[PDB]
């Protein structure tokens, strides 16, 4: 057998027709003697045992004109077999990329439409990865963004995704990461004294506070005991610091 490898090949090239046929083959196989229950059996067939990469992650890492349809098929298949939540929330197991999920891959790759579907279909909007991105498209691998989907969308200037997540009451907007940083501390780390970005970060900062109403984001302290303003002062970032101060009046 090479069913698993065929399925990874199909989602990677975007062969929608072949994928449907292969997943019918996989369904048929469930009836046969196996050493696992159906959900563990399917998850193994759909997950590289090596790295923990699922075929959903493989699909999002290889964007092509058929990706949205292939994502629909994979989620339908998982849902038909009662493993939708387990499948969509699977995490990389390879140490370097530990904790990365389908949802992080879609956001970093700026796939807003797919991102909305992944969230509605049950992707954990509070999941934190502390490994680096696997094969990121736009950001450096070790890009620091405050370790949440909301903070990832904000720090990469994707305000429609930030708005979608803030409307979702499952999202923990005041979450603090392994540094004790909340989304505003994260924005402070991404700010710089430029002119080409000297817009998006402060606009995002303002939009998050205005739309969330979570004013306490400004007064909560990270592990070094620093509010976002004090973090900007510690980092010697004059411009975002003057922006934050301006909020006082």
């Amino acid at each position: 057998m090479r069913l698993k490898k065929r399925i990874f090949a199909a989602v990677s090239e975007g062969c929608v027709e072949e994928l449907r046929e292969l997943l019918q083959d996989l369904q048929d196989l469930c009836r046969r003697r196996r050493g696992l229950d159906v959900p563990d059996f399917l998850m193994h067939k759909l997950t590289a045992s090596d790295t923990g990469k699922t075929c959903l992650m493989k699909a999002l890492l290889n964007i092509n004109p058929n990706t949205k349809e292939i994502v629909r098929i994979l989620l339908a298949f998982a849902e038909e077999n009662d493993i939708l939540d387990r499948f969509i929330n699977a995490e990389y197991t390879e140490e370097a990329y530990e904790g990365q999920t389908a949802l992080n891959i879609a956001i970093e790759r700026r796939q807003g439409d797919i991102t909305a579907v992944l969230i509605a279909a049950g992707a954990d909007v509070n999941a934190h990865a502390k490994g680096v991105f696997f094969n990121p498209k736009y950001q450096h691998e070790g890009f620091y963004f405050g370790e949440t989907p909301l903070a990832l969308a904000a720090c990469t200037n994707q305000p429609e995704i930030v708005q979608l997540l803030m409307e979702n009451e499952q999202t923990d907007i005041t979450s603090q990461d392994s540094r004790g940083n909340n989304i505003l501390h994260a924005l402070v780390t991404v700010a710089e004294d430029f002119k080409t970005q000297n817009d998006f970060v402060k606009r995002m900062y303002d939009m998050i506070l205005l739309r969330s109403g979570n004013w306490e984001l400004e007064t909560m302290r990270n592990n070094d005991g620093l509010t976002p303003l004090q973090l900007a002062a510690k980092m010697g970032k004059a411009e975002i610091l003057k922006y934050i101060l301006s909020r006082e009046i």
Side-chain angles (χ1 to χ4, degrees), residues 20-194:
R20 284 209 173 79
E21 296 174 11
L22 293 174
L23 290 175
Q24 172 68 259
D25 284 329
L26 174 57
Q27 198 74 62
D28 288 349
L29 203 58
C30 284
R31 301 233 94 234
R32 280 123 92 142
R33 184 175 178 273
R34 39 179 153 75
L36 306 169
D37 67 20
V38 175
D40 290 348
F41 177 81
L42 293 174
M43 283 301 298
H44 179 57
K45 282 282 184 299
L46 295 171
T47 307
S49 73
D50 217 350
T51 56
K53 183 196 302 179
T54 62
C55 54
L56 177 61
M57 295 173 194
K58 185 71 172 192
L60 296 171
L61 288 162
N62 293 284
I63 300 299
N64 59 74
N66 292 321
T67 299
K68 288 177 161 75
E69 181 172 9
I70 99 102
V71 169
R72 289 192 310 270
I73 294 169
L74 296 173
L75 299 174
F77 183 77
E79 160 65 359
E80 165 63 14
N81 288 283
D82 295 322
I83 53 171
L84 179 60
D85 172 80
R86 183 174 174 190
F87 176 68
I88 196 163
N89 290 310
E91 290 178 6
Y92 253 85
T93 58
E94 169 132 300
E95 357 299 314
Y97 312 103
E98 225 202 312
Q100 289 295 338
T101 52
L103 182 63
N104 276 7
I105 291 166
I107 297 174
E108 186 283 330
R109 260 164 166 81
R110 313 187 72 81
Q111 295 289 308
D113 287 351
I114 292 171
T115 294
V117 168
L118 289 187
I119 290 156
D124 182 351
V125 300
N126 299 304
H128 284 66
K130 290 189 284 172
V132 300
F133 293 110
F134 181 76
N135 198 19
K137 184 164 170 27
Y138 295 109
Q139 312 301 325
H140 181 288
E141 224 157 83
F143 176 54
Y144 176 69
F145 52 94
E147 301 174 3
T148 62
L150 182 67
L152 176 60
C155 287
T156 55
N157 195 12
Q158 293 185 84
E160 318 240 79
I161 298 179
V162 174
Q163 295 173 59
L164 180 70
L165 288 160
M166 291 188 310
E167 304 222 67
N168 187 327
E169 290 291 353
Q170 298 294 341
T171 305
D172 185 355
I173 290 178
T174 50
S175 190
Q176 287 168 276
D177 67 8
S178 67
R179 302 186 190 184
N181 280 351
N182 63 35
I183 186 164
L184 299 185
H185 291 99
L187 286 173
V188 165
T189 74
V190 175
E192 243 286 275
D193 301 330
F194 291 151

